[PDB]
Design an enzyme around this catalytic site. Structure first.
Site, PDB file in Angstrom:
ATOM      1  N   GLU A 110      74.535 -51.596 -51.561  1.00 42.75           N
ATOM      2  CA  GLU A 110      74.958 -50.623 -50.558  1.00 42.75           C
ATOM      3  C   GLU A 110      75.275 -49.311 -51.232  1.00 42.75           C
ATOM      4  OE1 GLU A 110      78.409 -52.024 -48.414  1.00 42.75           O
ATOM      5  OE2 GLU A 110      78.561 -50.162 -47.248  1.00 42.75           O
TER       6      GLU A 110
ATOM      7  N   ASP B 153      76.938 -46.118 -50.310  1.00 39.06           N
ATOM      8  CA  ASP B 153      77.738 -45.448 -49.287  1.00 39.06           C
ATOM      9  C   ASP B 153      77.733 -43.954 -49.559  1.00 39.06           C
ATOM     10  OD1 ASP B 153      78.574 -47.688 -47.677  1.00 39.06           O
ATOM     11  OD2 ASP B 153      79.836 -48.271 -49.357  1.00 39.06           O
TER      12      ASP B 153
ATOM     13  N   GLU C  42      81.362 -42.010 -46.245  1.00 40.44           N
ATOM     14  CA  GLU C  42      82.380 -42.683 -45.439  1.00 40.44           C
ATOM     15  C   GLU C  42      83.484 -41.678 -45.259  1.00 40.44           C
ATOM     16  OE1 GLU C  42      82.427 -46.325 -48.070  1.00 40.44           O
ATOM     17  OE2 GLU C  42      82.673 -47.213 -46.068  1.00 40.44           O
TER      18      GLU C  42
ATOM     19  N   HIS D 188      77.686 -49.468 -54.476  1.00 43.72           N
ATOM     20  CA  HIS D 188      78.121 -50.859 -54.640  1.00 43.72           C
ATOM     21  C   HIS D 188      76.928 -51.728 -55.042  1.00 43.72           C
ATOM     22  CE1 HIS D 188      81.949 -50.772 -51.993  1.00 43.72           C
ATOM     23  NE2 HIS D 188      81.346 -49.665 -51.592  1.00 43.72           N
TER      24      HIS D 188
END
Ligand SMILES: *[C@@H]1O[C@H](CO)[C@@H](O[C@@H]2O[C@H](CO)[C@@H](O[C@@H]3O[C@H](CO)[C@@H](O)[C@H](O[C@H]4O[C@H](CO)[C@@H](O)[C@H](O)[C@@H]4O)[C@@H]3O)[C@H](O)[C@H]2NC(C)=O)[C@H](O)[C@H]1NC(C)=O
Ligand SMILES: *[C@@H]1O[C@H](CO)[C@@H](O[C@@H]2O[C@H](CO)[C@@H](O)[C@H](O)[C@H]2NC(C)=O)[C@H](O)[C@H]1NC(C)=O
Length: 436
Positions: free
Chosen positions: A209, A211, A214, A225
């Site tokens: 992932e 990101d 966010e 991640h």
């Protein structure tokens, strides 16, 4: 799961741009699809509930396989039920619509296939309006290593596919998903104590992932991640790890990531209302995925961030944490940051940027979402976290929100008309999406 028929499915259109050089972009006619797990699950014959509140019907769903044969993911009334609208290059996600909270959407190449992005040695830009996102909400735009077809070629009892938003995975190895890999999650299903509409089953769905974004009007974080297997894989039981297993570090994915939140990195004046990036007004977020040799086949080495607001191009601020240098995500930064904050280096344990880059090589799906946090109230993003720690200790303070903020029952009651709007997506070579 079967393809539902009670409510018709039509994917809202959304344009985006591919750029070849600065000022030189062309338009793609995309569309978005709602994630499977927001949909009504109806029995194929009677149009009655397979799943009601947070429990399953035992006649339609006596086990995982039978459930997937007997039950369908319904189509979605995007605006009326889910508060999702689009217009041109803009996608607006409302927070509360009736009994519905938030949404998660994927960008489609076609009606049965997610758009795959190959991020290595590329740049991704978008505009966002976070002005109506208060404490506890997260307008997230990010990439996950989902299968382009949503699982259909691997899992014959998934007849719904990307057309119905199947196949999600992320670095939390989510076990809240009602269907994973062509099977329901009724075996081992445990209703959530604090959410009338959700639960946790034995199966989880893991993948790397990235990101990108966010954020709310208070704080933002950019966080890769990695997972041991880059693409989508099923886990079972508490060995899934991630937020909702007994031990978040028991599995194959890094649940924490290597994060850069400028407030957490010691510059509280950079991002927020009236700040250098003024979250009361829209702005542009640019993210670059650089490789060690600057080529498409190099190893992911650095993730850089620029913002543009009122036509001013503004680099990410430098870390002002002792021991942690620079304004970008690199192996050295990540190692140093975990040491300075006293956080476990799960990022390195699961392969760091090398494994994040391997996931990027596999291809990733763009996700746009709006959610509140039934585990930790988004305190990790915008407050002092953990809440028992001294807020002056490096790593604890992430935003201005009080530690009693972000409880879902509070924010859903007090901020139902909150929303996030994403727009003007651009993707291409480094420096092609903005004025470098
Ligand atoms: C939080 O992060 C922000 C964003 O990084 C940071 O603001 C930046 O602060 C610096 C220092 O005040 C600013 O840089 C100066 O900008 C002025 C005006 O453009 C220039 O005249 C300065 O140039 C001189 O100094 C340079 C070296 O710093 C030399 O290279 C040059 O030759 C000149 O001698 C200098 O560039 C910068 O503009 C802001 N950025 C923004 C977008 O506001 C802020 O300080 C951080 N806050 C905290 C509390 O840590
Ligand atoms: C993308 O643009 C940036 C900014 O113009 C380029 O980096 C500048 O490059 C020169 C070296 O050639 C340096 O002297 C500057 O300090 C750099 N600035 C920054 C902010 O990094 C970069 O080389 C461009 N990338 C590519 C692949 O063309």
């Amino acid at each position: 799961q079967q393809a539902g028929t009670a409510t018709a499915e039509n994917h809202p259109p959304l344009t985006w741009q591919e750029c070849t050089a600065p000022g030189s972009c062309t338009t793609q006619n995309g569309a978005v699809v709602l994630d499977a797990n927001w949909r009504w699950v109806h029995d194929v014959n009677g149009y009655t509930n397979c799943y009601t509140g947070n429990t399953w019907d035992p006649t339609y769903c006596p086990d995982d396989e039978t459930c997937a044969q007997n039950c369908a993911l319904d189509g979605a009334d995007y605006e009326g039920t889910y508060g999702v609208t689009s217009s041109g290059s803009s996608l607006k996600l409302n927070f509360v619509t009736g009994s519905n909270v938030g949404s998660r959407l994927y960008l489609l190449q076609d009606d049965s296939t997610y758009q795959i992005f190959k991020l290595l040695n590329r740049e991704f830009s978008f505009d966002v309006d976070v002005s109506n996102l208060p404490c506890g909400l997260n307008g997230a735009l990010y990439f996950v290593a989902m299968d382009a077809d949503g699982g259909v070629s691997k899992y014959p009892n998934n007849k719904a596919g990307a057309k119905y938003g199947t196949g999600y995975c992320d670095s939390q190895c989510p076990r809240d998903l009602k269907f994973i890999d062509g099977e329901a999650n009724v075996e081992g299903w445990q209703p959530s104590s604090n959410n009338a509409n959700t639960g946790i089953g034995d199966h989880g769905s893991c993948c790397a992932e990235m990101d990108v974004w966010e954020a709310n009007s208070i704080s933002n974080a950019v966080t890769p991640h990695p997972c041991d297997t880059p693409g989508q894989t099923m886990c079972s039981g508490d060995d899934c790890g991630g937020t909702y297993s007994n031990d978040r570090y028991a599995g194959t994915c890094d649940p924490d990531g290597c994060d850069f939140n400028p407030y957490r990195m010691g510059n509280t004046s950079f991002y927020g209302p009236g700040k250098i990036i003024d979250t009361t007004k829209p702005f542009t977020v640019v993210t670059q995925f650089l490789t060690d040799d600057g080529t498409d086949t190099g190893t992911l080495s650095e993730i850089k961030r620029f913002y543009i607001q009122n036509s001013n191009v503004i680099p990410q601020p430098n870390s002002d944490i002792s021991g942690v240098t620079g304004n970008s995500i690199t192996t050295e930064f990540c190692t140093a940051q975990k040491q300075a904050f006293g956080d476990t280096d799960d990022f390195s344990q699961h392969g760091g940027l090398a494994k994040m880059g391997a996931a990027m090589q596999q291809g990733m799906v763009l996700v746009m979402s709006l959610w509140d946090d039934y585990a930790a109230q988004m305190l990790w993003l915008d407050s002092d976290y953990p809440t028992d720690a001294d807020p002056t200790t490096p790593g604890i303070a992430r935003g201005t929100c009080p530690t009693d903020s972000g409880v879902p029952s509070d924010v859903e009651s007090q901020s139902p008309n909150s929303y996030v709007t994403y727009s003007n997506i651009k993707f291409g070579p480094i420096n092609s999406t903005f004025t470098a």
